[PDB]
Amino acid sequence: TKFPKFSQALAQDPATRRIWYGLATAHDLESHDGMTEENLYQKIFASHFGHLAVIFLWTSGNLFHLAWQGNFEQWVLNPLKVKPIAHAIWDPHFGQPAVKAFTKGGVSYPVNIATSGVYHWWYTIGMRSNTDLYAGSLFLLFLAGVFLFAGWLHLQPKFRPGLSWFKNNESRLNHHLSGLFGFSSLAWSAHLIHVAIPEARGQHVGWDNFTKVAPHPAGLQPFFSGNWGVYAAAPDTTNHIFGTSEGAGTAILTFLGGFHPQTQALWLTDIAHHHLAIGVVFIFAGHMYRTNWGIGHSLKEILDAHRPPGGRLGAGHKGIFETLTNSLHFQLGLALASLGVITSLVAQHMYALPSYAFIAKDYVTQSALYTHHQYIAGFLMVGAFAHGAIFFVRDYDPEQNKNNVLARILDHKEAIISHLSWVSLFLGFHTLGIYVHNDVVVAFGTPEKQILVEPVFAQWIQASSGKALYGFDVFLSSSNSVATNASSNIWLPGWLEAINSGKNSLFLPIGPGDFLIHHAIALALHTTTLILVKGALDARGSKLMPDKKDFGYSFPCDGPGRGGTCDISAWDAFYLSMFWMLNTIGWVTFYWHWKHVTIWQGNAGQFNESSTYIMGWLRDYLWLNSSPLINGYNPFGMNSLSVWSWMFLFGHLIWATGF
Amino acid sequence: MTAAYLPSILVPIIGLIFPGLVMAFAFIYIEQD
């Protein structure tokens, strides 16, 4: 048996455990037999190339399957009535009524109705026909092939990079900040100005004419003259019909703010100036570190020099440079945490400030996008803490980190875990007490006895952003404030028009139910943080098992002795925290979906009255909205929801199997 | 649908021939000494 060639101990296993453990440790290159650091980094580089190629192939497949089996050319003409098709159905297990019931979207074959929102994104960025969708799919197929060839090439001899190249922090930071963040943002701003904005105004720009169709009538002369504000003159009129020249402007860079009144999305000129500014800022950030020419900052000196002289941080950040450069797991935890934070930011900001035309009216698409990226956020944050725990198990050197910030985390880990436990128990005791209190007093016929705390802090924040609903009369909701007079000439009219109109998801009105569900969310975040931080900080050892670092990151137990040691490893803390992460994203998505359905129905008072007690959540959200789902198929017939009606039950099966 | 024969050709192939050969060859690889 030589399937796990990377593990001799696994390859000599005479049982079926060999296949499973070879499957689960196949990409754990650090634990393989005779792995050196240079080989480790080169394999990681090629695997990263392969994942990039996989992403490009998936996006090219989406583009191709739309150009072949979609209705994009029909959907561009009538975006608010035509149902977007994701891909075609060919299932030979279908009967004829299932063939009939899935034949939607104006086509003659069974199709699935798209929830990914690729229609709105591709339409907003200037695609109109099926031909350019296919051309983009071809370009991404070619790009994926190029990255596959690069992954093969950068593993070949006399191209394998050294460990000094991989650990060049300053060069990689400068190039990735200035080029990968900055120049990519500048090029996307260029694409918006050169292609997307003219196609939004009904004038076709492609590769055949983009060198002769100027983005602005004055050309690049106002840019080279320093008269940049000419690019801000004549913006799109409030009568503009998207994708046509009717009511179109000539501006390419504005900061108008708010939403386009027809698409209910952000102005494309605002997006172009935003990405241009982001490119300029990031290129300025990307000239910071010294690589070959004497100027620039040194990362080691910055880390060692920032030690507070009062001694409260100990030695400060001395030794963090070598600890971070030598540990890929510490880097992976930092990257996953930051990525999770920003995909949470994407999820909140894209429903609150949509950028794609007509996507604010696609309720299914908004729900799917929010739920998807929030679950991705929970997975990324859990992975960040898990791989930080792996960094403590495998890579943490105390002797290289004497009196460091990491060492001082370890020296007051007990205080951190105890205070996290205290705040988690605090939040859970009183949040559950208020919810159960409200349930008991509503069941006894006295809803006036409920404990309903108005969320005045967040309402004050909304008023500071300009919401005049609550009458706080402060900052942007005050017509005499210095912030109001400062921003009155630039962005205040459009922002105030968008924030004070109850037709969007911009700073939605909030009540006691919103208060309770955010404090429940705080409870769940603090408790998941408690589990994950306690797993990471006790990964090296505890009073029950002081030599845990000798046993690795993952092991079953330490036996029934010493009282019993079930689930004592940090991997087991990951395993316990996964349920709490699922609970937290469940609570967040339940709140988001119930609030948005009640606003979209024009029945927001149902949410305002029913979200303060658990029975309202169970009856008016779970039970009430389950009726079309459980009627996807019945003894009287079936319709297009039936697959979800299957999948729902499927979930109820497979979840139980996990138990 | 242009080239409508392609779903009816490829879906049985991708769903029955590809996994059967993949499971057979992976079985042969993981069980051979």
């Binding site: 394999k43 090629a46 695997s47 190339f49 392969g50 190629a53 192939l57 191709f64 150009a67 072949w68 050319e73 099926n130 031909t131 296919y134 799919s137 071809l138 197929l141 070619f142 994926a144 092939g145 596959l148 060839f149 992954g151 093969w152 593993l155 070949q156 | 242009t2 080239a3 392609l6």
Partner: peptide, 30 residues
């Protein structure tokens, strides 16, 4: 709309990507 020849071109590019992916997998497997 898209024609048969365009789908065939996409299939040829995907086969080229398959060959490159097989080569990358063999290179990673040592």
């Amino acid at each position: 709309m898209i024609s048969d020849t365009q789908i065939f071109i996409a299939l040829i590019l995907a086969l080229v990507s398959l060959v490159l992916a097989i080569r990358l997998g063999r290179a990673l497997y040592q």
